[PDB]
Each structure stands twice: as structure tokens, then as C-alpha cells.
Amino acid sequence: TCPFYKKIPGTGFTVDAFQYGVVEGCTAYFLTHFHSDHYAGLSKHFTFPVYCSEITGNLLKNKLHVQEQYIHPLPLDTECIVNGVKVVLLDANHCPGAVMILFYLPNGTVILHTGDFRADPSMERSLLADQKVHMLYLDTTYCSPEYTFPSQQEVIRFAINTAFEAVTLNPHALVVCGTYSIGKEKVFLAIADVLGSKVGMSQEKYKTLQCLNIPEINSLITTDMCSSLVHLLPMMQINFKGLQSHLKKCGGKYNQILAFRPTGWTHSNKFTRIADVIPQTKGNISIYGIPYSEHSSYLEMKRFVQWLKPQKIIPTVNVGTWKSRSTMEKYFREWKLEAGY
Ligand code: NI
What we know:
Number of helices: 8
Protein name: DNA cross-link repair 1A protein
Family: Belongs to the DNA repair metallo-beta-lactamase (DRMBL) family.
Organism: Homo sapiens (Human)
Subunit structure: Binds constitutively to TP53BP1. Binds CDC27, which is itself a component of the anaphase promoting complex (APC). Binds PIAS1.
Order of helices and strands: EEEHEHEEEEEEHEHEHEEHEEEHEH
Bound molecules: nickel (II) ion
Distance between the termini: 35 Å
CATH topology of the largest domain: Metallo-beta-lactamase, Chain A
Radius of gyration: 22 Å
Subcellular location: Nucleus
């Protein structure tokens, strides 16, 4: 049974609602981005129209084998008519192909669904500037003041410098970066660029990266692992056991591993500056946890919402406990009283 916060009132539309079977009255299923919690339920046997970005469409076709006739890609920043309702897709600053959706209801109501997003001041000069939003369906993943983390630029700077230093000291070292989904590709692409290397990876991961419309991608990645000094591995293998085993595999070409686990927030954010971050070390292996977020900080979320001044807010994350829901409602009221809407 589909929950209320995935329904768009006064339309036949749902958002990210693929795990409930056939939804009663739904004529179009929107998908905000290609992350499993959101696509959960789609497969090659789906026969309803799916509306999404070009990138999300490339992934549905190639990775999930959804048939072409049910995939409806829309350009960004463009007024489109779907089943007689005007819609716009906006970049969400999340993972590749992730969108926010603006719906202009036939009765005059305007609704923004953020999907997953990392709010940014640049969004204040999109097509959002032009008119009023009555309802906001908000990605509230980090809606609490304890959730602080640095910009994505500062995090990339720390990784580039760390990696370049280590490999310049030891030309026989290997950099490994963990992944479990699309997103956060800048981590491994920036490190490989500074080292003058391609990024090596499995055939399955190469196929995923080939769907993302990244410029010059053929110049950046490869399946020939041993030609490369940046490798990608599944996130679950980024530990001393998994990396010991990986170090065997190149035929003793490498005598040191430096590894990155991009997480979201961890409690070490409440005490440690990014510059001050230190790895866990065992012998010739070091693992760095780095706070590369593709969701809004509390401060970024507050700024966006105070700027948008919506009439109602519906959270889409952390909605399962009464304590969570109560905490989020208190912050929405402070923000409104502080700004005066
Ligand atoms: Ni996501």
C-alpha cells in the first residue's frame, strides 16, 4: 500500500512508488533518481509509463532492462505537458540524473518534490524564482543541527592532496575507492586525474558509468585494472581483510594501499575538522573515511526552505518515528517564525 507522501493530489501521478504493485489511479510513475530505495520494484516486466531524466532512462534500459516503450525521458529546465499537467524537472545536485519535479496543478496549486537533493544557493536562480510554491515534499535526511559536514570542494581537495602525497613518496602504492551505487564519482575521478591514471573497475561498474553522459568518459575509465593505479571496489570490501586479498591480486605490482570510504555524515564530524582527519592503519594498508555528502546539511536545508517560503512542508525521510516527526515539525516552525512567512 502506497503511503500518502508519495502521492500527488489532483493528478494520476506518483513519485518513487514502484514497490506497491499497480497503484490505483496512477497513469504516470515518476522516478527522481537511480538509487535502489527509490526504484525498488522496477524490472524488465514493468508496463506503465515511467517519467524521468535522460540519465535515469539510460540506467533503466541498460541496467534494469525496462523496455524502451515505457521509458519517457524529459529535458531539464523545460516546461513539459504530461497527461495534461505542466511539469518541470530541475537538477537536484544529488547523484547523476537526479531531479526535483515542479508540478503546476490544474486548480492553481504549485508543488515541488525535491526527491533526494543537496540544496545550493544556485537553486535560488532556477525557474523556482518565478513563482510561489504551496506544498514542498522535502528530503529531510539530515534535518537536525548536529548534521554538519564540509563542502564537496574541500573534501575533494583533502583527497587529491592525500593521494598525490602518498603516491609521490611511493610510486608502487595503489589507491582504492569504495562504491555501492551511482553518485560521488568526483572522488575517484579527481584522484585519478592528479595521478595521471585511468580508473580501473569491473565490467558491471564500467557499464553503469557508460550510462551517465560524463564528457570524455572513454579517456577516464577502463576495465584493464593492472594498467591503472586507482581501482574501484564494492564498499563492503573496504576493510583490512578485503584489501589484503586485493593486494595479492595484481601479481605483487603494488606494496601499499591507500583507500577511501566516502560515507555520509559520521559522529567524528561533531569533533574533527576535515584537515585533521586521520586514517585507520594496519601494516602497509590505510583506510580514510571522508564526509562526502550528496544530501543537504541542516544549514543548507534551512536556507533553501527560508528562501522558498512554502505554505506546507511534507517530509519524505525519517518519517517512521513519532520522535523524528515531532523534531522536524519544531524546526519547520522555528524557521517560519524566524523568517516571518
Ligand atoms: Ni538517493
